[PDB]
Ligand binder design. Structure first.
Ligand SMILES: CCCCCCCCCCCCCCCC(=O)O
Ligand SMILES: CCCCCCCCCCCCCCCC(=O)O
Lengths: 135, 135
């Protein structure tokens, strides 16, 4: 019952929600209208790390809900089921979606965080990823 | 086109996915079986900060998808639509769900991150939240 952990986890969740809103409201690209961030997370999971059940757990979704969500991405021909696999279009989509995101966050963070803070964040987050990621 | 920003944002997204998996796979509480993390995010958004359209943007979901998701939470009587509002049950659920989460993360982080790192994370994340959160 550590107040510091309550606040750390709450802040993490807030940075996700408020960053998500900032990006959706602030970029112009058609892909950031066509594809939700939750859809982009399916594509980036297949790209990097996927069965329907594993996807559900990694996205924090009930297994029962994941079928109907995958249907929309199959209809858009960004994934296929064979495991889930990216199509060439899906790879093209998630690379450009990510480029739009990274360019936008880099321009927002200019003159608000310094190089020292960015470099520290990389070491802190690699460490946190290694703690959390199960074998 | 800053490599450091690409890696920072990618790491943030990975800590979300791998932390989500760690918690779902590692805690015992009935609420962390009944309620998905995505459902818990609707309850915590109403609790803290909600129209259907605002919720969609903050969760990174298409507006078209949010109705059918809210239906399950209405059927469980954790929310009502009147804006979205928490019920007493919804408040009870999200307080216990959060307690389970915070207790678990605090025990996982014991002897893996030090007090200095936790306290630094609070200052860094308050700053990042303030940059991202729109008016
Ligand atoms: C002090 C901060 C330095 C790190 C530089 C920025 C890291 C950004 C991490 C939070 C990003 C939140 C955006 C969520 C949107 C998304 O990933 O789709
Ligand atoms: C060096 C780190 C110190 C901070 C202490 C822990 C902060 C944890 C932040 C990542 C939590 C990820 C868990 C996601 C699950 C969820 O919130 O439902």
């Amino acid at each position: 019952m550590d107040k510091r952990i309550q606040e750390a986890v709450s802040l993490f969740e807030e940075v996700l929600i408020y960053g998500t809103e900032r990006v959706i409201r602030s970029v112009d690209d058609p892909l950031w209208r066509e594809y939700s961030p939750e859809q982009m997370q399916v594509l980036k999971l297949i790209y990097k790390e996927i069965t329907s059940g594993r996807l559900a757990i990694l996205q924090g979704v009930h297994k029962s809900a994941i079928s109907n969500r995958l249907k929309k991405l199959i209809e858009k021909e960004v994934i296929s089921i064979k495991i889930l696999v990216l199509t060439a279009l899906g790879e093209t989509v998630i690379k450009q979606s990510d480029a739009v995101l990274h360019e936008y966050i880099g321009k927002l963070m200019t003159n608000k965080v310094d190089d020292q803070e960015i470099e520290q964040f990389l070491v802190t987050f690699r460490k946190l990823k290694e703690i959390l990621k199960m074998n």
